[PDB]
Scaffold this active site. Structure first.
Site, mmCIF file in Angstrom:
data_model
loop_
_atom_site.group_PDB
_atom_site.id
_atom_site.type_symbol
_atom_site.label_atom_id
_atom_site.label_comp_id
_atom_site.label_asym_id
_atom_site.label_seq_id
_atom_site.Cartn_x
_atom_site.Cartn_y
_atom_site.Cartn_z
ATOM 1 N N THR E 138 0.826 -1.204 0.000
ATOM 2 C CA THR E 138 0.000 0.000 0.000
ATOM 3 C C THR E 138 0.857 1.249 0.000
ATOM 4 O O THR E 138 0.734 2.093 -0.893
ATOM 5 C CB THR E 138 -0.912 0.019 1.215
ATOM 6 O OG1 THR E 138 -1.557 -1.249 1.347
ATOM 7 C CG2 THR E 138 -1.937 1.119 1.087
ATOM 8 N N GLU E 247 9.801 26.860 2.000
ATOM 9 C CA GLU E 247 11.208 27.221 1.924
ATOM 10 C C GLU E 247 12.171 26.047 1.949
ATOM 11 O O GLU E 247 13.314 26.210 1.510
ATOM 12 C CB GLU E 247 11.580 28.163 3.071
ATOM 13 C CG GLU E 247 10.630 29.312 3.222
ATOM 14 C CD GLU E 247 10.998 30.233 4.356
ATOM 15 O OE1 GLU E 247 11.897 29.871 5.142
ATOM 16 O OE2 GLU E 247 10.393 31.321 4.460
HETATM 17 N N1 LIG Z 1 10.559 2.800 11.031
HETATM 18 C C1 LIG Z 1 9.313 2.343 11.136
HETATM 19 N N2 LIG Z 1 8.862 1.472 10.189
HETATM 20 C C2 LIG Z 1 7.615 0.987 10.255
HETATM 21 C C3 LIG Z 1 6.762 1.347 11.256
HETATM 22 N N3 LIG Z 1 5.597 0.716 11.072
HETATM 23 C C4 LIG Z 1 5.704 -0.039 9.963
HETATM 24 N N4 LIG Z 1 6.963 0.108 9.461
HETATM 25 C C5 LIG Z 1 7.540 -0.464 8.239
HETATM 26 O O1 LIG Z 1 6.536 -1.099 7.525
HETATM 27 C C6 LIG Z 1 7.099 -2.053 6.688
HETATM 28 C C7 LIG Z 1 6.060 -3.139 6.490
HETATM 29 O O2 LIG Z 1 5.164 -2.758 5.480
HETATM 30 P P1 LIG Z 1 3.735 -2.181 5.866
HETATM 31 O O3 LIG Z 1 3.797 -1.414 7.138
HETATM 32 O O4 LIG Z 1 2.763 -3.315 5.954
HETATM 33 O O5 LIG Z 1 3.357 -1.172 4.701
HETATM 34 P P2 LIG Z 1 2.032 -1.407 3.836
HETATM 35 O O6 LIG Z 1 1.961 -0.334 2.787
HETATM 36 O O7 LIG Z 1 0.840 -1.387 4.744
HETATM 37 O O8 LIG Z 1 2.113 -2.869 3.181
HETATM 38 P P3 LIG Z 1 0.843 -3.837 3.097
HETATM 39 O O9 LIG Z 1 0.478 -4.348 4.459
HETATM 40 O O10 LIG Z 1 1.176 -4.984 2.188
HETATM 41 O O11 LIG Z 1 -0.313 -3.063 2.548
HETATM 42 C C8 LIG Z 1 8.339 -2.533 7.401
HETATM 43 O O12 LIG Z 1 9.416 -2.505 6.506
HETATM 44 C C9 LIG Z 1 8.604 -1.505 8.458
HETATM 45 O O13 LIG Z 1 9.847 -0.932 8.171
HETATM 46 C C10 LIG Z 1 7.197 2.221 12.202
HETATM 47 O O14 LIG Z 1 6.429 2.525 13.087
HETATM 48 N N5 LIG Z 1 8.472 2.726 12.156
HETATM 49 MG MG LIG Z 2 -0.771 -2.694 4.528
#
Ligand SMILES: Nc1nc2c(ncn2[C@@H]2O[C@H](COP(=O)(O)OP(=O)(O)OP(=O)(O)O)[C@@H](O)[C@H]2O)c(=O)[nH]1
Ligand SMILES: [Mg+2]
Ligand SMILES: Nc1nc2c(ncn2[C@@H]2O[C@H](COP(=O)(O)OP(=O)(O)OP(=O)(O)O)[C@@H](O)[C@H]2O)c(=O)[nH]1
Ligand SMILES: Nc1nc2c(ncn2[C@@H]2O[C@H](COP(=O)(O)OP(=O)(O)O)[C@@H](O)[C@H]2O)c(=O)[nH]1
Ligand SMILES: Nc1nc2c(ncn2[C@@H]2O[C@H](COP(=O)(O)OP(=O)(O)O)[C@@H](O)[C@H]2O)c(=O)[nH]1
Ligand SMILES: [Mg+2]
Lengths: 54, 51, 427, 50, 430, 428, 440
Positions: E138, E247
């Protein structure tokens, strides 16, 4: 989230099966089974006394 | 067999053993490797770069 | 929301489906008559993944129980949890399969495949967004191996885009019940490559090695081996039932494990298994899950990954824990030994973290690992197909149900192609 | 023996409390010098020398 | 009248926006149920209604319900309006193709309607903020679709990006590189500025600066929220040099293909190492240029700076700021590029940073957030290219992308485009 | 975070290791159930050198227990401290070796090894910074010496930067327990040569000469001989567990005593041992450790350095004591006995001082000494190999597991090099 | 304004830095936990402590020190002792494995890992300083960290910091007793590689301070604290012209200029005269002539070499307490008249004096007395050329048979660095010759 960095969690931790009979030993928690045999020795001696009187 | 002669010749006609480089991060002593981390330049030295 | 329709067939499928549904109902707080007697609120939130609703607050499962003899599902109607299964879901035939792949595929199970397909189509379109299906069967038998593969073939013509899973029980040269399990296994494993998205491998000789070398049970039964199969059957679907820090459904593990569409034969293993006398010597910590889950003494298949190369590796953690100590142990395993990991993937391992541990427990983990060591499973079976087949061993049983010898001839050149498919990455 | 130890703790600790109050008074008396304010005349009383 | 519309996409976006909006509700005097127990400094984030409530200007988006349902029945369930938290039905499943074409198309139009409804209430809207993750389906595909649809409706408006870039060593997934390359190539011309964070770098900062061994995503989200508040502080609190949102793009982006800066927050220390150390302007300025405190695991001593922005919060004085900057202009460690003779943009704000209960960092009087644009970020795209090659030589994982309606030539054209990007970063520094 | 994974193999290995783990647990205040019931704060600070942690404040050792007899494990669980070990770490076979080498090196001990190499990597990888290993075994028997030289040989090939020691109980001629022991002793000492970093030599007739004469016990048993073996086992690893004024650990001692990597056969000793008749008659001063620790009667080998030359000397002291009186006696024994030291190393003695005494004691001291007077130990095994081997004596017992007679031939020329290497460094 | 950054490296350096920084807390008013008890003028007060202590906003004074080790068990006594609230937590750097009596491990393999972490912390202390005089370094030649990493620390202090002064205190190895076997190879390969990268070097041996404690003080059976406490009486007397008022100030730049003539000869020898016990100080007056003559006694030297076999090349004299500058002038003219003490012919002036006012501080538990007057003296002597001759002797002795070099060769060192480090010293052993003959 102090508990994740807690230096005393392993001091105040308590095992998943502390005793044989406790409440939190259901079927999804897989520290309790039915095939482990306790009361096997008594079944064996009961069968042998029945064999004698037989 | 001369051990006193040969033990001298074992160390001179050789090579020093170069280490895998390491950086220590914190005051506690946390030791990592240098090449695998994203710090030292290693991957722009490839032949695929910029073409 | 995201429903899972459970299908299971055979004595092996029903005795697994009787023990899996006991695990889930204790996990969602369901007493053996239907009602809900839990204590949290998260137990009642996503409960429609498995349980349908009825009148008077009664939750009955989304299962279909299929067989070819009636005597197997009278011990399922009369067990502890026999009263929660909806009694119209039971489908039984009067005469069995008799350790015959043919009789269950073309004659006896061709008249019962259209009876189950009324049940599934009735109820899998009662859902709101069905995620996919699930099978559990035995390739060494006659019903699950002959007619369970017939239901897989029919429902992938009607519901193609969805998910299919199998917790298949491939046979074992050491622990061997029947004589004619080479013919049943070989003709069904060709039906598995074209019609399943994921497929695991289970050997009863590899579940025995857990109950003797790890849990130290004196008299293991089939009621303990079904506990361990169902350990890796709820721990895979555990992040669409409970929230977490990093979620993963069934499809997100399909994207990250299988590179090519004919390479999907994983093998499971479950992390906190501990003997009764070794219970107080353990620490329930994140390093000690990721290091017995990866043990080759632990796997639920009878093939060892110290002969082959890990194509991909999955891991589904449960329980409140830290994302730093989960992530550092996957880099810790991938870099000590770069001979058991493939080169044209830079990071093979996938992680997902749920929140709710198994009921009565603190932490948990599961392993879904794809290997090139899974090809020795097939060639220890294809060495006894062509041992029997050169002399036409038991062939008169099978040819009389309307096949030809070409159906016996194509099903080893399809099996050997997959063996050589998994071979070119082993070196 | 437990209650005897707690009695001795209380005794030495009351001594500490009195010394804390006297220490603060002598700090405030060690502040002062010529162009500091909050200093003023007082009658010569015998309570000063007692 | 100086409004900011926040857009969070993905599970990373939702779990970051939870901590950010908690910080805002506690920074102004706003309860977790909308009421306020006057001044209008909340008006860049919260809009008043006729029932005394102050509802945020945000849009949370996910393709999967079990991460926004916790917002819907958490502590802050009465604060968020029920139609600002949009959920799909089945997630994108680590797939750029699913997140872009087949699944994001049922969800793009409702979010565009909500953004029109929010942007037709801000009289003085500055621009949008997008918080997302490269790795997820996503947060890559739908975010890039949203960036493609924003520009044709709003044009020259400012849009900013906070990106969870893939970390150099540990990654949660296998199909991170295809997602990363295919989002970089298709957002490269529709974005104005893209700040990077890395979860591994914030793990190292929480392990080493703070003492919190075994940190968690919430411990990371608090520091990300501190950075966001320091960027948007001067639109709400009174200052001696205000820095408007229009900016950062002007003073950090020399070329329209190079818009990739990196972030640092200076006094991230704990409540025992704040007792021992004074935290003056020179110390917190000199600690932003340290390669052990960066928020991407990369070293700018191997590269050349091209622009710098320094945001100061608290009890700060212009000559102490000036003396610190003129000290750091004299190191031979800090080498600038040939064609950047000035270098810096400086902003000064009065309000000291706000402490959350339960948090990690201590209460301080002075803080710096610095956004620097460096040539030393070329090794990041070099490793990303190499790992894309390592998977794509043997055509791994390609059917998972092709089966949901995208051709195979996009892999080839994305690797060619980012090869041109590598030559750009090579040639602008000489 | 300088961990010691302690291996022990054989009946001699297991019932030394059961007594070494009784003195460590009392030294760190571990009651037999596992828990900690001490009083100080230095008994818990560095306890992870040897002990892991479990749930509930329980500490289980980093030990692995290896044998080919299943009836040796029940002797381990019959002691006072038999329930502190995790039960997975016992490795028991089913059929013993029974005074043989190839039975333990190729046939039965070569298929028991690959289930132990899971157990040592089970534990070596779960250390923060592993320092090295230990082994305790007897060369006379078959399990400890047939397979215990293959346990060493695999783990040097996998972990070649770490440390390895052996507390080897090499056989003695006067206490000749078993006839076929010169073949096991000869054939295994060459596998000690290439792989091990340090190696001591603990003869059983040397321990009997102490308990008869120094301690004056009427009935010494093997429980009063594992006491002395383990009193010098923990006097080496004591200053990386407790702080000191001058420090030394296992790596620093190997640097200073081993000038060439084929020269690592020491001669341990232990200072304050006193009988009960001479108990009340003694003064607990500093030179009453150095007079006994350097006494040629006190060594734990059955060889004497009045015949040969000390290449180097180590010494580890325990107790709050004075660095001037520690240092001046080292000079005092170097200057006087001026014919018992090599010329080509001019400061032969290394010194450490550890603050914490062993519990119950006030001071103590431990010795490790490298000599060319330990070549007289190897020539006595070589004299009773070729006195026995020329007439092809017990050869059919060994050659029927697929050895070779030339493999026998190479195993004295591998031993006749060290007895003529130690001679040229004795001429120097 | 007159800052100086102490660097302590090794277990020898850390344990010395405990006794040095105990003295500095009582010499000023600072408690063990980092607070002055009260300030009589809170807005006023004296800021004499800025050479050593750095003050935060509230009340807390933090030292300008970095404690370096590669073994954890030495610094963890500092980390949970009395002074655990005084030291900032990040100034006490440790390792995880020590360097293990090895120049190669300390330089190339193990010590080249902490070098870019200490250089970070040194810049943080060198940017507080308005007026940094120079670094001080405390180490021991016979260690791994004190010899390998310390020789590495001088080299990247030259590159990064230029000409900024880098003074040393070292524990040169004692000639008779020695707690090591490979103490020659360290002491050669560290002295050789820090000739060009060092500014001055005051040397003391543990055996020589053993002689004074048993004889001049009454304490028989000392401990390393009784040696550490006398070293803190030397470093304070060097630096007390920077904190307390003086009739002749002496900065830290004037020792190299007045004791180091030629660019390979920078090795003076320390001496501290009135260390007498509190019963043996009850009987004798301790005037300026009684304590000037006692520095020149070879039985009160703080090194095991006698200057009666050599020629003095320069001198430095630092006086504390109650001294008249006229009576300082009377004693120096007397010690020139004795022909038991000889000066080299090309150095006719040969002195540098400094008169302070603050008498040296009594510390509770120390064995000295309360005394008005004191002298610390640093003198460069040609009679150090007999000390390398008994270290050539013991380097070549193990080098004839090439003992122990297998430890060093496989630890990153090629073997050709042995046959240049000694052959460098051969020039230095004959370089001390040519300044030791008269100018005919
Ligand atoms: N640094 C950081 N990374 C996060 C955090 N929450 C989620 N992530 C990142 O999220 C990634 C996992 O993908 P998703 O969070 O599921 O992103 P998405 O777009 O929802 O992907 P889908 O679930 O397939 O739809 C991991 O690589 C984490 O690095 C956070 O709170 N801090
Ligand atoms: Mg997701
Ligand atoms: N004068 C004096 N010398 C000391 C003191 N402590 C240790 N030493 C010297 O320390 C030397 C031994 O090396 P150490 O300093 O203990 O250890 P190190 O420098 O850390 O080197 P490694 O042990 O290899 O890490 C001996 O030569 C002693 O002379 C002390 O307190 N005072
Ligand atoms: N693991 C496991 N195996 C089973 C179970 N029940 C039967 N089996 C195995 O399955 C085979 C027999 O199953 P079968 O009744 O023939 O299956 P069906 O033909 O589909 O009905 C034998 O190999 C059994 O060992 C079970 O509950 N668990
Ligand atoms: N010092 C000592 N010697 C022992 C011990 N146990 C056995 N031995 C000696 O070792 C020999 C017997 O060893 P054995 O048990 O057969 O060898 P293993 O099977 O390898 O352990 C005899 O000479 C004994 O004197 C012990 O606990 N201590
Ligand atoms: Mg040390």
């Amino acid at each position: 989230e102090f508990d994740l960095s807690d230096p005393l969690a392993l001091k105040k931790d308590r095992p998943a099966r502390q005793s044989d009979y406790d409440a939190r030993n259901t079927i999804s928690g897989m520290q309790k089974f039915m095939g482990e045999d306790l009361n096997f020795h008594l079944r064996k001696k009961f069968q042998e006394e029945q064999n004698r009187e037989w | 067999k001369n051990f006193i002669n040969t033990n001298a010749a074992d160390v001179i006609m050789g090579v020093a053993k170069k280490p895998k480089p390491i950086y220590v991060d914190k005051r506690t002593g946390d030791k990592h490797d240098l090449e695998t981390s994203g710090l030292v330049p290693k991957y722009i030295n490839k032949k695929d770069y910029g073409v | 929301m995201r429903e899972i329709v459970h299908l299971q067939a055979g004595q092996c499928g029903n005795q697994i489906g009787a023990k899996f549904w006991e695990v889930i109902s204790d996990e969602h707080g369901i007493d053996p008559t239907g009602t809900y007697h839990g204590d949290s609120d998260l137990q009642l939130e996503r409960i429609n993944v498995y349980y349908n609703e009825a009148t008077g607050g009664k939750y009955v499962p989304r299962a279909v129980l299929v067989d070819l003899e009636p005597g197997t599902m009278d011990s399922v109607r009369s067990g502890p949890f026999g009263q929660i299964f909806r009694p119209d879901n039971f489908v039984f035939g009067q005469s069995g399969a008799g350790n015959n792949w043919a009789k269950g595929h073309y004659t006896e199970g061709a008249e019962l495949v259209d009876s189950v397909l009324d049940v599934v189509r009735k109820e899998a379109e009662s859902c709101d967004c069905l995620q996919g299906f699930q099978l559990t069967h035995s390739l060494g038998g006659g019903t699950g191996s002959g007619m369970g593969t017939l239901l897989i073939s029919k429902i992938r013509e009607e519901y193609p885009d969805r998910i299919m899973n199998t917790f298949s029980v491939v046979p074992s040269p050491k622990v061997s019940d029947t004589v004619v399990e080479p013919y049943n296994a070989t003709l069904s494993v060709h039906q598995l490559v074209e019609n399943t998205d994921e497929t695991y491998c289970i050997d009863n000789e590899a579940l025995y090695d857990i109950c003797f070398r790890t849990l130290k049970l004196t008299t293991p039964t089939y009621g303990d081996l079904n506990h361990l199969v169902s350990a890796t059957m709820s721990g895979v679907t555990t992040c669409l039932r409970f929230p977490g820090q990093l979620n993963a459904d069934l499809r997100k593990l399909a994207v990250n494990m299988v590179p090519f569409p004919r390479l999907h034969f994983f093998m499971p293993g479950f992390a906190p298994l501990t003997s009764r006398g070794s219970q107080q010597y353990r620490a329930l910590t994140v390093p000690e899950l990721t290091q017995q889950m990866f043990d080759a003494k632990n796997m639920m298949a009878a093939c060892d990954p110290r002969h082959g190369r890990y194509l991909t590796v999955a891991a589904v953690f449960r329980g409140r824990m830290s994302m730093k100590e989960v992530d550092e142990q996957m880099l810790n395993v991938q870099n000590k030994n770069s001979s058991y990991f493939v080169e044209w993937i830079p990071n093979n391992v996938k992680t997902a973290v749920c929140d709710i541990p198994p009921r009565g427990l603190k932490m948990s983990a599961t392993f879904i690992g794809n290997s090139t060591a899974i090809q020795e499973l097939f060639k220890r079976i294809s060495e006894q197909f062509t041992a029997m087949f050169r002399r036409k061993a038991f062939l008169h049983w099978y040819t009389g149900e309307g096949m030809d010898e070409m159906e016996f001839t194509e099903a080893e050149s399809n099996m050997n192609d997959l063996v050589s498919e998994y071979q070119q990455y082993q070196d | 023996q437990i209650r005897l130890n707690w009695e001795h703790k209380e005794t030495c600790e009351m001594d500490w409390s009195d010394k804390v109050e006297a220490y603060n008074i002598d700090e405030a008396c060690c502040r002062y010098n010529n162009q500091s304010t909050d200093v003023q005349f007082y009658p010569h009383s015998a309570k000063f020398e007692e | 009248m100086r409004e900011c519309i926040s857009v969070h996409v993905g599970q990373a976006g939702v779990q970051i926006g939870n901590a950010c909006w908690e910080l805002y509700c506690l920074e102004h005097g706003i309860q977790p149920d909308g009421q306020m127990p006057g001044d209008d400094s909340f008006n860049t984030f919260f809009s008043e209604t006729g029932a005394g409530k102050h509802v945020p200007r945000a849009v949370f988006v996910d393709l999967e319900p079990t991460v926004i349902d916790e917002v819907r029945t958490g502590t802050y369930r009465q604060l968020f309006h029920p139609e600002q938290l949009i959920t799909g039905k089945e997630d994108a499943a680590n797939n750029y193709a699913r997140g872009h074409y087949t699944i994001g198309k049922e969800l793009i139009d409702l979010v565009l309607d909500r953004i029109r409804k929010l942007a037709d209430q801000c009289t003085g809207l500055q621009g949008f903020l997008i918080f997302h993750s490269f790795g997820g389906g996503t947060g890559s595909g739908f975010t890039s679709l949203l960036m493609e649809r924003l520009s044709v409706d709003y044009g020259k408006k400012s849009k900013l990006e906070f990106s969870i870039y893939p970390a150099p060593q540990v990654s949660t997934a296998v199909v991170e590189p295809y997602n990363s390359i295919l989002t970089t190539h298709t957002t490269l011309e529709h974005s104005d500025c893209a700040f990077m964070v890395d979860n591994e770098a914030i793990y190292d900062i929480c392990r080493r600066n703070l003492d919190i061994e075994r940190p968690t995503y919430t411990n990371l989200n608090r520091l990300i929220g501190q950075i966001v508040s320091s960027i948007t502080a001067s639109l709400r609190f009174d200052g001696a040099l205000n820095v408007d949102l229009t900016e950062f793009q002007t003073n950090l982006v020399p070329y329209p293909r190079i818009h990739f800066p990196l972030a640092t927050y200076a006094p991230v220390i704990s409540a025992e190492k704040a007792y021992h150390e004074q935290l003056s302007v020179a110390e917190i300025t000199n600690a932003c240029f340290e390669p052990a405190n960066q928020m991407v695991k990369c070293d700018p001593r191997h590269g050349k700076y091209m622009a710098c922005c320094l945001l100061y919060r608290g009890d700060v004085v212009p000559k102490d700021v000036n003396a610190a900057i003129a000290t750091i202009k004299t190191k031979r460690t800090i080498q600038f590029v040939d064609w950047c003779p000035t270098g810096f943009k400086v902003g000064i704000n009065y309000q000291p940073p706000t402490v959350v209960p339960g948090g990690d960092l201590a209460k301080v009087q002075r803080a710096v957030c610095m956004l620097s644009n460096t040539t030393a970020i070329a090794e990041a795209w070099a490793r990303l290219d190499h790992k894309f090659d390592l998977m794509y030589a043997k055509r791994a994982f390609v059917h998972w992308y092709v089966g949901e309606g995208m051709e195979e030539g996009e892999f080839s054209e994305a690797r060619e485009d980012m090869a041109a990007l590598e030559k750009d970063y090579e040639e602008v520094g000489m």
